[PDB]
Symmetry: C2
Subunit: 180 residues, 2 copies
């Protein structure tokens, strides 16, 4: 589970399976990927675990962004992009802000489409900011669980129907040469 909190001016993302793999990845490469979208460096772990820690009790608290003025500045490296990401405080920090269904990095996709090195700004009164209403509209258009469930079911139906329909057509052509 992902839980966002504000401690002072620091935005903290708490991560709650055997969670030892997070610490092992940080020991091996001094980086870790959480929820498939968040890339954290060892310097971002506020609570480095004990050598004898029981990880059942433990939760990982990571520095995710900085609260400056009314905007949460997420470093681009956290999202594997070059630009930084600014989310206004009026927008609730949750995973759906950054990820669509099937772990699609919203800002990872947007940054590749942008022709400017200027940072992504969502909400607030900054003039260059994607309006909160425009961002929320994109969120509602992004594929949800039901759309992916219908896509999978339709694909299975089309495949099974194509086998039955082709079987019937092949039988019909053979029976065109058959009295019975």
């Amino acid at each position: 589970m992902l839980q966002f909190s504000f401690v002072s001016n620091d935005v903290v993302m708490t991560y709650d399976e055997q969670i030892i793999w997070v610490w092992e990845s940080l020991n091996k490469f001094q980086t870790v990927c959480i929820s498939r979208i968040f890339n954290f460096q060892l310097q971002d772990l506020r609570n480095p675990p004990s050598t004898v820690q029981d990880f059942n009790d433990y939760e990982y608290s990571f520095n995710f962004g900085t609260l400056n003025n009314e905007y949460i500045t997420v470093p681009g490296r956290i999202l594997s992009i070059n630009r930084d990401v600014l989310i206004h405080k009026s927008i609730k920090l949750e995973r759906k802000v950054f990820a669509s269904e099937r772990n699609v990095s919203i800002f990872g996709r947007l940054s590749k489409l942008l022709d400017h090195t200027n940072p992504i700004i969502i909400g607030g009164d900054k003039p260059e900011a994607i309006p909160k209403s425009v961002f929320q509209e994109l969120q509602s258009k992004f594929p949800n669980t039901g759309e992916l469930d219908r896509y999978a079911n339709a694909r299975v139906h089309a495949i099974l129907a194509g086998y039955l329909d082709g079987m019937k057509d092949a039988r019909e052509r053979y029976e065109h040469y058959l009295n019975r």
Copy 2:
């Protein structure tokens, strides 16, 4: 996790989160849905749990089918269909035999498409049986994790591209009336 085993002539599906909800559903409605595709009645639970059971240690063992001749006969009620399902022993019992990605009931979809009350037979030497090669070909065509991941990513890309392209088009039309 789902694990299929043969005890005598009985096919057993073992189910391994707080697994108490399975027992609670069986107490409330004498039925339970496991992995979203398997419907088990209370009579199918081989190891009814103790009133004091620790469910961390416990695993649920359910009667899934009957081994007769060389075919595993799955009751239709296990799959929420009217026909029964016969899987030849040469086919390994696993979840992908019955479910496609996003919990799509393979035989739930097929049975609605069939115009006959005759049971679904997969593999073996029975004449009315879908050949093992035909069944395996359908399995490979069914959507996998990568196809659903690409679908979601493409949908997000098309939505973000449609916002940027429409923004550029609207700006261009306004600039057609602007000297600068």
